[PDB]
Design an enzyme around this catalytic site. Sequence first.
Site, short mmCIF file in Angstrom:
data_model
loop_
_atom_site.label_atom_id
_atom_site.label_comp_id
_atom_site.label_asym_id
_atom_site.label_seq_id
_atom_site.Cartn_x
_atom_site.Cartn_y
_atom_site.Cartn_z
N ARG A 77 -3.02 -8.99 21.95
CA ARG A 77 -2.85 -9.73 20.70
C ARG A 77 -1.49 -10.44 20.74
O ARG A 77 -1.23 -11.35 19.95
CB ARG A 77 -2.97 -8.79 19.50
CG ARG A 77 -4.43 -8.50 19.11
CD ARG A 77 -4.55 -7.46 18.00
NE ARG A 77 -5.95 -7.10 17.74
CZ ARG A 77 -6.34 -6.20 16.84
NH1 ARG A 77 -5.45 -5.55 16.10
NH2 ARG A 77 -7.63 -5.93 16.69
N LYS A 88 0.81 -1.21 0.00
CA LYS A 88 0.00 0.00 0.00
C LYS A 88 0.85 1.27 0.00
O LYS A 88 0.56 2.19 -0.73
CB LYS A 88 -0.93 0.01 1.22
CG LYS A 88 -2.10 -0.96 1.14
CD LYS A 88 -2.82 -1.12 2.49
CE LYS A 88 -4.12 -1.91 2.34
NZ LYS A 88 -4.65 -2.48 3.62
N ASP A 105 3.84 -6.21 12.18
CA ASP A 105 2.71 -7.11 11.92
C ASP A 105 3.09 -8.55 11.69
O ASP A 105 2.21 -9.40 11.47
CB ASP A 105 1.92 -6.61 10.73
CG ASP A 105 1.30 -5.25 10.98
OD1 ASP A 105 0.79 -5.05 12.09
OD2 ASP A 105 1.32 -4.41 10.07
#
Length: 443
Positions: free
Chosen positions: A350, A21, A319
């Site tokens: 997470r 992106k 990530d």
Amino acid sequence: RPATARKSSGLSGTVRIPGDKSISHRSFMFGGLASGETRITGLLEGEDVINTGKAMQAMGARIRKEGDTWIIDGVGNGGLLAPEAPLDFGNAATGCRLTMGLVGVYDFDSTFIGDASLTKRPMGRVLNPLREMGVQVKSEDGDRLPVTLRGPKTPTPITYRVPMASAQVKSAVLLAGLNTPGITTVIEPIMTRDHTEKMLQGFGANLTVETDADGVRTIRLEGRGKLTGQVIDVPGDPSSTAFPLVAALLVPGSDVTILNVLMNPTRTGLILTLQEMGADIEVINPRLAGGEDVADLRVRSSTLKGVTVPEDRAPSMIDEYPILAVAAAFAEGATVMNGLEELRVKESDRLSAVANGLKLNGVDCDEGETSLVVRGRPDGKGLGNASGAAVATHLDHRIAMSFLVMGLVSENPVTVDDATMIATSFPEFMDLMAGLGAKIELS
């Protein structure tokens, strides 16, 4: 929508990953700003790219797509035309902020608006340096959209010390620097993603980077310099690349070639880590794309060895901790992942989901407040979960995919409580993986 991955027999295939992106965004923006024509293939046509392209078009760039190629005839640096209407960025916060940086220094009014979501986002980190360059800023609340910008006839270059390491702020200032006479300098305490720097250089900009003994980076950009059209085949998203990459390394009898892999070190902490872990990753066809290092990777099943991952590498692979932790579950010895910094400014957010998913899947690992420790089992024996116990993804696409990758290797299947979030992040995941021979059963 739970999904289950079952031990794969061996992955093989050549795949290309959806374009990154950031590089797509900059390719489209620079393509519209540069003199001459830019041809882009592999463009990730996401909100930031689309909206940024719309804005570039609104300011004079001529854009068209022929075949799989976007063709942009740019306006030339400093050539942006005043937009006839507000630049709506929908929810594209990045495209919005970078465009503000680019356009704010232009001596015409620019109004930025966006959907309810983006309208609540703070823009001050980008608006402040623009004001320092002489840009008149009209914004709402705590510097939120809608925002109207009007650059001075002649902006002043600035030496901006990013109050807080931010690739985006750095990017906004450098773009602002493009229409500013003199040298705009950004000093960042640590090196952050440098796609703007790389792509500016790729487009012919006179930009240099100085790094001092402490790693503090001084990026200098000669403003109002030329930018010329380029042929850009956008490198794939590093985070999406991670999955087939790790799956091929882990599933024995696998031999996979991943095309157009971004090799920029600020994005490849995972690849670097896997390499240290002894991953059989062959870098082939190295080349440049818009100033970015690119190569294809021929990934063969390897025996990974545990390593200690330094906290300073985390930014380059933020990530990828979920899939690295999964890779660690099949690596010799222990893998130590440090850095409690910000896994949501926490070391159990997470991060705990990953640890829990691993544990749920028989993985011997220890979650600390500072480091995640995983002791692997290369043959995956005893791993996975024969009862169908589903990993709680917590709507995290990274966890869903990392654990689906895990099931391709574990002796017992791995189930994720949900795969829907994969459609929103790496929708081609299921097809690409199955294409490689991965067996993923979707609820």
